[PDB]
Amino acid sequence: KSRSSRAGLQFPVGRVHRLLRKGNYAERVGAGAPVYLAAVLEYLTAEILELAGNAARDNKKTRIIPRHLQLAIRNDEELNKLLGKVTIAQGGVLPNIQAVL
Amino acid sequence: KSRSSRAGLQFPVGRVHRLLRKGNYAERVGAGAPVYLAAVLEYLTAEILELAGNAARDNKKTRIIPRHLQLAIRNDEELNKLLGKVTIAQGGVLPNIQAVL
Amino acid sequence: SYSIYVYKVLKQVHPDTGISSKAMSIMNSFVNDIFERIAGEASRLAHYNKRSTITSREIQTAVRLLLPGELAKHAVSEGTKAVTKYTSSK
Amino acid sequence: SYSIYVYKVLKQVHPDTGISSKAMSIMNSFVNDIFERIAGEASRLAHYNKRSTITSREIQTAVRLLLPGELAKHAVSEGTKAVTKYTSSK
Amino acid sequence: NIQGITKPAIRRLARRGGVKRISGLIYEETRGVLKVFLENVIRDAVTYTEHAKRKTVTAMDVVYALKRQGRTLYGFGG
Amino acid sequence: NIQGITKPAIRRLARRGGVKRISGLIYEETRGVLKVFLENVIRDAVTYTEHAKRKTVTAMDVVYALKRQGRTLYGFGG
Amino acid sequence: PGTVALREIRRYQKSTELLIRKLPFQRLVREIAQDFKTDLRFQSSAVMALQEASEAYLVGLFEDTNLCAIHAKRVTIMPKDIQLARRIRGERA
Amino acid sequence: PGTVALREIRRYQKSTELLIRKLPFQRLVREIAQDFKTDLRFQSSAVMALQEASEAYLVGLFEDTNLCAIHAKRVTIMPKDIQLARRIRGERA
């Protein structure tokens, strides 16, 4: 049976496992390594994808476009740190006008 | 005969060669790789060591202390970029007072 | 590259909200990015501790180091939950 | 760790100027640093170009990428000069 | 040629930045920075190209160039 | 405890920074930043320690912590 | 006048489109590339990636510049603000 | 008065010594470490590394703060300068 299903995951454990060794990161990568990493990847994906989906609804749409990912990422204080020096193509900027104006 | 001498160098070609593979940077590192890297390391060493030695004389001393490395690195515009986000322990700061004062 | 999975995860979270190809592009960039980041630190941790193998214990510490505050706590939980299922779920 | 060599290089440049232990500490940090930096990019370059081996051609491009303007030009010259001697100097 | 960038365009860019009033000098000043930014990025971008022996600069090259600049860009691969 | 840092010390630190006049408020403000800076660094520093199973935080730990902070420090190894 | 300014901020902050005409930008890229290597060609997406990153960089710069302008007593942004921002940002020409 | 200030700048800019008393600093490190892990001990050099880096960080911050203060019309540095600097520096609490 599937390593992705055995671990109760969506993200490809196998693929992640290939990338870990191909990458020449390690000499030999253990068994739980890709399953843990795959797990974290899926988690974060779900997280930003959730907040993004919310922003999509809040406007008026059903399809999530970059603007949503952007608005999503920038509004969560925690996610904003992680992707601090990241530029979302077609993400635009978070609406904001310095008070003093 | 020595790989360091065959290449006309001071820095340990062999050591650099060990570090390249141990490091798990590559799958297999070529023959000229460590000799080129060792070469660049020795060069940069000589460079900053030269400017440092100058600053040591300019003050009044014979021994190069961190202050010299600092004063040296910060004064060469090119070296200052390379070690831009580097902190020289006991290096102190480059004497400078904003004109307006 | 991840489009399959990210879509699979999407339906799991919002089973009625679609995603654009361009937005999918971004998601893929995100996945590869933090993968590269985490594996980089994991690898760094292993060399420091003179270990020739990247254990899940490295992925975890890497996750603690790279991810924010509470966002990191879940990622560890999720990973431990996931790793443990797989190990027991032979 | 490099103290031997850095001292050897020092006499070669200033055959009358000594260096403190603490200053030697710094020099060692410098050597390890830019080593780590250069090998990191070299390694990055190799994966991008799906090559399993780090050639000197990678050390060079890495050097061009990491080092400043004219400071990089010499480093390439020195490395090519050095590599070539070694290869011919069998 | 950089003169092809335009007062409007820069004003819009400033507007998105939340800038209300714009001194007439920042238009040429901004052209200065945009050029320096592009030079630095394109230089490293072609260095990556000159590495795989490709005469064409791919979008992945601009990405690696940007990552080297400390500016990660999403949407063109990974 | 951070109150152990001192007005003098901060003034000196400012002086080295090329600061001429110092408002009386920046002394407490600076303590704020110094603490946040140390927390962030020591947190990651002990995380590195908790990795080799060492109860003692070595100087190499503070170094890796700092490199993670984007602040490379020379003089304690490499 | 204040009203139109803010009205423009509001509109362009809500926007997600590239603000520079494609063509002029592409020329700037070609006219720069030619220095580093004369026989160079950029794919359209590679150019596109550069613009997405260039304009992103610029608004980000503008935000910071704005904070400097306000730091004095002004609303109008001057070159000295862009410079003070780039300085603290660690940037250099 | 201006004369003593500059005289202090000149002297402390020429200096290379740590400006904070060793002991108080060491306590701050211990009193912080205790949160993350109660059974923690720092080697003296590890503490030393932290101070070298801490004071380095602070003067660097001070330089930038100074540039902000001057940016208005002032010579006296206020909290709003440290904040504007840290802001553009990308720092956060």
Specify the long-range contacts of residues E41-45, CB closer than 8 Å, at least 24 apart.
Answer: E41/E65, E41/E66, E41/E69, E41/G50, E41/G53, E42/G29, E42/G32, E42/G33, E42/G36, E42/G50, E43/G36, E44/D65, E44/E68, E44/E69, E45/G46, E45/G50
Element (H, E) at E56: strand E56-57
Q: Look-up: residue for tokens 């996945």?
A: C31
Which chain A residues contact residue G14 at CB under 8 A?
Answer: 92, 95
User: Which two structure tokens, joined as six digits, stand for B64?
Assistant: 């190069």
Under 8 Å between Cβ of H71 and G84:
yes
Does any domain span residue H1? no
DSSP per position, H53-68: HHHHHHHHHHHHHHHH
Q: Does B86 touch chain D (CB under 8 A)?
A: yes
Q: Three-state SS for H77? A: strand
Does any domain span residue G10? no
Q: How far apart are CA C87 and CA B53, in angstroms?
A: 60
User: Which two structure tokens, joined as six digits, stand for A47?
Assistant: 């997280």
Q: How far apart are CA H79 and CA F22, in angstroms?
A: 10
Tell me if G67 and H84 make a contact (CB, 8 A cut-off): yes
Under 8 Å between Cβ of A96 and E18:
yes
Closest among H46, B45, B4 to D30, alpha carbons compared: B45
* Planar angle of CA B39, D55, G46, nearest 5 degrees: 110
Does any domain span residue H11? no
**Closest chain D residue by Cα to residue A19:** D47
Which amino acid, one-letter code, is at E28?
E
Q: How far apart are CA C22 and CA A81, in angstroms?
A: 23
Closest among H81, G17, G13 to A101, alpha carbons compared: G13
- The three-state DSSP-derived secondary structure of chain C is CCHHHHHHHHHHHCCCCEECHHHHHHHHHHHHHHHHHHHHHHHHHHHHCCCCEECHHHHHHHHHHHCCCCHHHHHHHHHHHHHHHHHHCC
Under 8 Å between Cβ of C54 and C43:
yes
Chains that touch F (3 or more CB pairs under 8 A): B, C, D, H
Q: How far apart are CA B22 and CA A30, in angstroms?
A: 18
Q: Does D79 touch chain B (CB under 8 A)?
A: yes
Chains that touch C (3 or more CB pairs under 8 A): A, B, E, F
Q: Three-state SS for A28? A: strand
Q: Three-state SS for E57? A: strand
Kindly tell me the burial class for residue E7, based on how many C-beta atoms sit within 10 Å of its own C-beta (0-12, 13-18, 19 or more): exposed
The third-level CATH classification (topology) of the domain covering D21-85 is Histone, subunit A (1.10.20)
**Closest chain B residue by Cα to residue H13:** B95
Interface of A with B in 17-46 (CB under 8 A): 24-27
Under 8 Å between Cβ of B72 and B52:
yes
Does any domain span residue H3? no
Query: Any idea where the domains of chain E sit in the sequence?
Result: 1-76
Tell me if B36 and D80 make a contact (CB, 8 A cut-off): yes
Which chain B residues contact residue A27 at CB under 8 A?
Answer: 24
Distance (Å) from the C-alpha of residue A101 to the closest C-alpha of chain C?
Answer: 33
What are phi and psi for residue B18, nearest 5 degrees?
-65, -50
Q: Does A23 touch chain D (CB under 8 A)?
A: yes
Which amino acid, one-letter code, is at E35?
K
Does any domain span residue G85? yes
- The three-state DSSP-derived secondary structure of chain F is CHHHCCHHHHHHHHHHCCCCEECCCHHHHHHHHHHHHHHHHHHHHHHHHHHHCCCEECHHHHHHHHHHCCCEEECCCC
B24: left (phi over 0), alpha (psi -120 to 50) or beta: left
Does any domain span residue G11? no
**Closest chain C residue by Cα to residue F61:** C48
Q: How far apart are CA C67 and CA C59, in angstroms?
A: 12
Q: Three-state SS for D53? A: strand
Given A87, A96, A101, which is nearest G52 (Cβ)?
Answer: A87
E6: left (phi over 0), alpha (psi -120 to 50) or beta: beta
Q: Kindly indicate whether the domain formed by C3-88 is annotated with CATH number 2.40.160.40.
A: no
Which amino acid, one-letter code, is at G64?
D
User: Which two structure tokens, joined as six digits, stand for B79?
Assistant: 């070296």
D50: left (phi over 0), alpha (psi -120 to 50) or beta: left
Distance (Å) from the C-alpha of residue B97 to the closest C-alpha of chain H?
Answer: 8
Does any domain span residue G61? yes
Domains defined for chain A, CATH in brackets: 1-101 (1.10.20.10)
* Chain C meets chain E (3+ C-beta pairs below 8 A): yes
For the domain E1-76, what is the CATH code?
A: 1.10.20.10
Q: Three-state SS for A88? A: strand
Structure determined by: cryo-EM
Angle between helices C21-48 and C56-66 (to 10 degrees): 110
Number of separate domains in chain G: 1
**Closest chain B residue by Cα to residue A27:** B24
Distance (Å) from the C-alpha of residue G37 to the closest C-alpha of chain A?
Answer: 27
Neighbours of E72 (CB within 10 A): 20
Tell me if B11 and D34 make a contact (CB, 8 A cut-off): no
* Chain D meets chain G (3+ C-beta pairs below 8 A): no
Which amino acid, one-letter code, is at B10?
Q
